[PDB]
């Protein structure tokens, strides 16, 4: 560039411009491309940040870093105390909190302003650990909107979080699956340091300062270069928003290395946090007192975000698979608070994934990580569908590290990146201004949400995101987004009786009409049928005990909805019975199963997906052995659903009194997180159309108000569910020798799940018919209940 150019009239010009032109944008410095001038320009310190009584009315001097002359005001540059110190005026955080009922903005403003304040490594327990040293910080969260924490995506690190925040995607979707990543595709190494990081290839997406442009709405800068000291960012900000209103941006961000860079040095909560703290709390006042003397304190919607929380994490705790693995030097790994596994050299015959996996599994009894093929992740973490997610995953306890060698770890006292349900990983959310609530509590929520709550404030259509749109409604005073329910594709077939029981060949060793017209479907289908939004055949086959909606393409129910009181009764189930398998005379032999199957296939077993143990009477008991309630189930597997089905459903019906379940098969073979049509199911019961599903989910509802039976409840609900992997081993639980009730409940609360994320896998939509408004609707879909305290 012709860096003999100058910045003179252009310091933080927000649109970049190229060769020959020097530049004089806030990207100039990570391209070496400003011009000469921009540091004595641009980057102004003298005198410092604060005006003091002195210089209240001094003639202007250009070379001060900001200004407490008269005309300060109009030019949008004065220090961000001058209405204090030179005219009287109250600091922001000295007033009281009074309710922003409508946006209060100057003339020529067509939309409140929004700006987006994120903090590195900021803790959700921070809001209440520090809140003597935060003042500014305090009255955000009290008088604005606040939950008690954010749920960061998967790794919980910087890079993944903030691209998350920035576009409402998954990281798997996104592209930035960690702050290390190998693409294979175009043989690429990222890093944190260095220039490939640059490369717009890694950034897929659409993050919201392109949403904006592209509809009309101007933005700010989103990277602030790290030498670019935060007082200097925040007076930049506020340059902006003294523009001409067809140059001044509507969406703005700040980013703070703190307090992370210090979490990292010291840990969470280590002495040295306390001036971090209060140093953040400090830029936040600044700002406040800059936006109030430009008069839009009163204007401006303000997200107080961080991208992850912030765990004690010593050199010492750390597990080295030089310790497990003859062959460590055949292998790369990406270390640290996660591991990510592949071959040192494509061109290894010797190289094998199985004999990895298997000398990193249960290897010493306190092991501080666990092994994963990536389709064995937990789905909640949606970690697997992108090429540059290896095949081969550690996940990390919290407080450890992974490490290839010992060499290699020869500092720091905290970390993260640990999985996002870890109480340490949570970070924090406040918003305030005119178009969040007042002085609201909202419950903790994900940071996927946010790009669509921030595309409401800024009038923008989202770009199609793995937010849930009005999930976050309740946050908002005005700029709800309404959906409609989507449309249900296929509509039930209501089979009657068509078939004689020699019809079948099953190969199996072996009032109640009011009941099969649908007479307790009130009480077992609680909140309407779930739609199929998507084209196939299926039955709805109703029962004393329980009703499905019966696929004739997958030969099994897409799910099993049924009801357990407080006082259900549990009974036992001989094996008899479990043999003797009936042909269901509403579905015919071609779209059945059989017992020949699953009698031919030695490794695959079966069980049903209503629980024939809370059958409520012998007539009722039959139909849990019907053929069409029954499902492929690995012996492996069946003793984990035998102890949820047998033990756990009526300890969740006495402590939530009563529950309804909804379970069923999910199909994701491909694991990109979407239900899998029939062509893509890789697995089959042998000798059989009978697909095998690679998890089976439950849905458990009941009343958040336990005082009133699930059956009987006239408020909001309550929700937890699982998606269960259906593996032929149970190599995942390492005690799993034991009884089931010293294992199964722990694999269990590890695979949580929302009913989002069984609503993708699936192509089901459920709580069609409820009392309940859809946007409270769509806010319990996106419940996960974490199990952490
Ligand atoms: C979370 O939300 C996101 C956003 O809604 C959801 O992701 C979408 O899911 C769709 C289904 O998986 C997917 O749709 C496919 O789009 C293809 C076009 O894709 C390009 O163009 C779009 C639009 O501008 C762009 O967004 C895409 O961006 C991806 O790819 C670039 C690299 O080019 C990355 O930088 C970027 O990060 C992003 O990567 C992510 O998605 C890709 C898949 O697109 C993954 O490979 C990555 O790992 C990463 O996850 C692209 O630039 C389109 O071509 C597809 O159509 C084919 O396949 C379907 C199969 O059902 C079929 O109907 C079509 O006929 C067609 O078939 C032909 O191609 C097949 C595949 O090669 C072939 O085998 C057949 O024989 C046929 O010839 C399909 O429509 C959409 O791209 C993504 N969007 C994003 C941003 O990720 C996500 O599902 C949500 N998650 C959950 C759990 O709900
Ligand atoms: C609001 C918002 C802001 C930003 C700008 O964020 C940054 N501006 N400037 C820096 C950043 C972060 C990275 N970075 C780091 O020093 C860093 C720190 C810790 C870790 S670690 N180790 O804690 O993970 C890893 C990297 C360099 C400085 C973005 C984008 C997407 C543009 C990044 C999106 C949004 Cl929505
Ligand atoms: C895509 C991407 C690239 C890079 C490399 O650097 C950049 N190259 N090109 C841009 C960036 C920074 C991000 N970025 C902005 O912050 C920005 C700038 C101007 C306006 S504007 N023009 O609307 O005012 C709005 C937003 C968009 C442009 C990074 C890292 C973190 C590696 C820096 C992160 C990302 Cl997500
Ligand atoms: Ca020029
Ligand atoms: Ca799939
Ligand atoms: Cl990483
Ligand atoms: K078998
Ligand atoms: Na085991
Ligand atoms: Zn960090």
Same mark, same amino acid.
């Given at each position: 560039?012709?860096?003999?150019?100058?910045?003179?009239?252009?310091?933080?010009?927000?649109?970049?411009?190229?060769?020959?032109?020097?530049?004089?944008?806030?990207?100039?410095?990570?391209?070496?491309?400003?011009?000469?001038?921009?540091?004595?320009?641009?980057?102004?310190?003298? =005198?410092?940040?604060?005006?003091?009584?002195? =210089?209240?009315?001094?003639?202007?001097?250009?070379?001060?870093?900001?200004?407490?002359?008269?005309?300060?005001?109009?030019?949008?540059?004065?220090?961000?105390?001058?209405?204090?110190?030179?005219?009287?005026?109250?600091?922001?955080?000295?007033?009281?909190?009074?309710?922003?009922?409508?946006?209060?903005?100057?003339?020529?403003?067509?939309?409140?302003?929004?700006?987006?304040?994120?903090?590195?490594?900021?803790?959700?327990?921070?809001?209440?650990?520090?809140?003597?040293?935060?003042?500014?910080?305090?009255?955000?969260?009290?008088?604005?909107?606040?939950?008690?924490?954010?749920?960061?995506?998967?790794?919980?690190?910087?890079?993944?979080?903030?691209?998350?925040?920035?576009?409402?995607?998954?990281?798997?979707?996104?592209?930035?699956?960690?702050?290390?990543?190998?693409?294979?595709?175009?043989?690429?190494?990222?890093?944190?340091?260095?220039?490939?990081?640059?490369?717009?290839?890694?950034?897929?997406?659409?993050?919201?300062?392109?949403?904006?442009?592209?509809?009309?709405?101007?933005?700010?800068?989103?990277?602030?270069?790290?030498?670019?000291?935060?007082?200097?960012?925040?007076?930049?900000?506020?340059?902006?928003?003294?523009?001409?209103?067809?140059?001044?941006?509507?969406?703005?961000?700040?980013?703070?290395?703190?307090?992370?860079?210090?979490?990292?040095?010291?840990?969470?909560?280590?002495?040295?946090?306390?001036?971090?703290?209060?140093?953040?709390?400090?830029?936040?006042?600044?700002?406040?007192?800059? /936006?109030?003397?430009?008069?839009?304190?009163?204007?401006?919607?303000?997200?107080?975000?961080?991208?992850?929380?912030?765990?004690?994490?010593?050199?010492?705790?750390?597990?080295?698979?030089?310790?497990?693995?003859?062959?460590?030097?055949?292998?790369?790994?990406?270390?640290?608070?996660?591991?990510?596994?592949?071959?040192?050299?494509?061109?290894?015959?010797?190289?094998?994934?199985?004999?990895?996996?298997?000398?990193?599994?249960?290897?010493?009894?306190?092991?501080?990580?666990?092994?994963?093929?990536?389709?064995?992740?937990?789905?909640?973490?949606?970690?697997?569908?992108?090429?540059?997610?290896?095949?081969?995953?550690?996940?990390?306890?919290?407080?450890?590290?992974?490490?290839?060698?010992?060499?290699?770890?020869?500092?720091?006292?905290?970390?993260?990146?640990?999985?996002?349900?870890?109480?340490?990983?949570?970070?924090?959310?406040?918003?305030?201004?005119?178009?969040?609530?007042?002085?609201?509590?909202?419950?903790?929520?994900?940071?996927?949400?946010?790009?669509?709550?921030?595309?409401?404030?800024?009038?923008?259509?989202?770009?199609?995101?793995?937010?849930?749109?009005?999930?976050?409604?309740?946050?908002?005073?005005?700029?709800?987004?309404?959906?409609?329910?989507?449309?249900?594709?296929?509509?039930?077939?209501?089979?009657?009786?068509?078939?004689?029981?020699?019809?079948?060949?099953?190969?199996?060793?072996?009032?109640? =009409?009011?009941?099969?017209?649908?007479?307790?479907?009130?009480?077992?289908?609680?909140?309407?049928?779930?739609?199929?939004?998507?084209?196939?055949?299926?039955?709805?086959?109703?029962?004393?005990?329980?009703?499905?909606?019966?696929?004739?393409?997958?030969?099994?129910?897409?799910?099993?909805?049924?009801?357990?009181?407080?006082?259900?009764?549990?009974?036992?189930?001989?094996?008899?019975?479990?043999?003797?398998?009936?042909?269901?005379?509403?579905?015919?032999?071609?779209?059945?199963?059989?017992?020949?199957?699953?009698?031919?296939?030695?490794?695959?077993?079966?069980?049903?997906?209503?629980?024939?143990?809370?059958?409520?009477?012998?007539?009722?008991? +039959?139909?849990?052995? /019907?053929?069409?309630?029954?499902?492929?189930?690995?012996?492996?597997?069946?003793?984990?659903?035998?102890?949820?089905?047998?033990?756990?459903?009526?300890?969740?019906?006495?402590?939530?009194?009563?529950?309804?379940?909804?379970?069923?098969?999910?199909?994701?073979?491909?694991?990109?997180?979407?239900?899998?049509?029939?062509?893509?199911?890789?697995?089959?019961?042998?000798?059989?159309?009978?697909?095998?599903?690679?998890? +089976?989910?439950?849905?458990?509802?009941?009343?958040?108000?336990?005082?009133?039976?699930?059956?009987?409840?006239?408020?909001?609900?309550?929700?937890?569910?699982?998606?269960?992997?259906?593996?032929?081993?149970?190599?995942?639980?390492?005690?799993?020798?034991?009884?089931?009730?010293?294992?199964?409940?722990? /694999?269990?609360?590890?695979?949580?799940?929302?009913?989002?994320?069984?609503?993708? /896998?699936?192509?089901?939509?459920?709580?069609?018919?409820?009392?309940?408004?859809?946007?409270?609707?769509?806010?319990?879909?996106?419940?996960?209940?974490?199990?952490?305290?």
């Amino acid at each position: 560039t012709a860096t003999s150019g100058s910045c003179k009239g252009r310091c933080f010009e927000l649109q970049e411009v190229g060769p020959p032109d020097c530049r004089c944008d806030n990207l100039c410095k990570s391209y070496s491309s400003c011009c000469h001038d921009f540091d004595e320009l641009c980057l102004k310190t003298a =005198r410092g940040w604060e005006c003091t009584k002195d =210089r209240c009315g001094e003639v202007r001097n250009e070379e001060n870093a900001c200004h407490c002359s008269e005309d300060c005001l109009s030019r949008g540059d004065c220090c961000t105390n001058y209405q204090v110190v030179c005219k009287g005026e109250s600091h922001w955080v000295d007033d009281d909190c009074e309710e922003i009922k409508v946006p209060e903005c100057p003339a020529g403003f067509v939309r409140p302003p929004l700006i987006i304040f994120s903090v590195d490594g900021f803790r959700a327990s921070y809001m209440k650990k520090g809140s003597k040293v935060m003042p500014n910080i305090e009255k955000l969260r009290s008088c604005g909107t606040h939950a008690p924490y954010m749920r960061p995506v998967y790794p919980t690190k910087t890079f993944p979080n903030l691209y998350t925040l920035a576009t409402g995607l998954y990281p798997e979707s996104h592209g930035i699956v960690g702050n290390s990543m190998y693409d294979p595709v175009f043989d690429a190494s990222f890093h944190l340091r260095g220039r490939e990081k640059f490369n717009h290839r890694w950034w897929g997406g659409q993050p919201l300062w392109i949403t904006a442009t592209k509809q009309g709405v101007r933005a700010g800068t989103f990277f602030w270069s790290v030498s670019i000291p935060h007082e200097r960012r925040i007076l930049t900000i506020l340059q902006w928003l003294s523009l001409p209103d067809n140059e001044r941006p509507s969406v703005y961000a700040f980013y703070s290395e703190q307090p992370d860079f210090s979490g990292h040095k010291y840990g969470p909560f280590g002495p040295e946090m306390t001036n971090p703290l209060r140093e953040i709390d400090k830029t936040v006042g600044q700002l406040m007192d800059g /936006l109030k003397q430009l008069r839009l304190h009163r204007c401006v919607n303000v997200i107080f975000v961080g991208d992850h929380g912030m765990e004690d994490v010593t050199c010492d705790r750390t597990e080295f698979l030089s310790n497990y693995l003859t062959n460590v030097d055949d292998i790369t790994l990406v270390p640290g608070t996660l591991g990510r596994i592949r071959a040192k050299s494509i061109n290894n015959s010797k190289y094998d994934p199985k004999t990895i996996i298997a000398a990193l599994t249960c290897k010493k009894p306190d092991q501080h990580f666990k092994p994963y093929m990536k389709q064995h992740l937990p789905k909640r973490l949606h970690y697997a569908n992108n090429r540059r997610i290896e095949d081969i995953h550690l996940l990390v306890d919290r407080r450890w590290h992974v490490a290839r060698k010992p060499l290699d770890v020869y500092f720091f006292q905290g970390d993260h990146g640990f999985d996002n349900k870890v109480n340490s990983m949570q970070t924090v959310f406040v918003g305030y201004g005119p178009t969040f609530k007042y002085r609201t509590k909202v419950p903790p929520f994900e940071n996927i949400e946010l790009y669509n709550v921030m595309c409401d404030l800024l009038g923008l259509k989202p770009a199609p995101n793995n937010g849930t749109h009005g999930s976050l409604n309740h946050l908002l005073r005005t700029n709800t987004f309404r959906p409609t329910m989507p449309d249900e594709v296929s509509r039930p077939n209501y089979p009657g009786i068509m078939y004689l029981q020699s019809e079948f060949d099953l190969g199996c060793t072996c009032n109640k =009409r009011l009941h099969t017209k649908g007479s307790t479907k009130e009480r077992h289908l609680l909140y309407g049928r779930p739609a199929v939004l998507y084209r196939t055949s299926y039955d709805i086959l109703y029962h004393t005990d329980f009703e499905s909606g019966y696929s004739e393409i997958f030969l099994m129910p897409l799910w099993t909805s049924y009801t357990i009181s407080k006082q259900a009764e549990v009974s036992s189930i001989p094996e008899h019975l479990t043999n003797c398998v009936r042909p269901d005379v509403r579905v015919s032999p071609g779209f059945s199963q059989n017992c020949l199957a699953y009698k031919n296939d030695k490794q695959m077993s079966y069980g049903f997906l209503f629980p024939p143990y809370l059958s409520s009477s012998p007539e009722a008991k +039959y139909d849990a052995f /019907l053929v069409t309630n029954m499902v492929p189930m690995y012996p492996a597997f069946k003793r984990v659903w035998a102890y949820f089905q047998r033990v756990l459903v009526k300890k969740y019906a006495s402590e939530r009194n009563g529950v309804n379940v909804i379970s069923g098969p999910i199909f994701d073979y491909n694991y990109d997180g979407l239900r899998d049509t029939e062509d893509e199911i890789k697995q089959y019961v042998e000798g059989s159309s009978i697909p095998v599903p690679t998890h +089976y989910y439950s849905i458990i509802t009941s009343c958040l108000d336990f005082t009133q039976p699930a059956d009987k409840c006239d408020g909001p609900l309550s929700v937890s569910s699982f998606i269960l992997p259906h593996r032929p081993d149970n190599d995942e639980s390492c005690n799993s020798s034991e009884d089931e009730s010293k294992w199964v409940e722990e /694999l269990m609360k590890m695979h949580t799940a929302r009913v989002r994320d069984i609503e993708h /896998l699936t192509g089901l939509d459920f709580y069609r018919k409820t009392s309940r408004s859809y946007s409270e609707i769509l806010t319990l879909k996106t419940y996960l209940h974490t199990y952490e305290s």
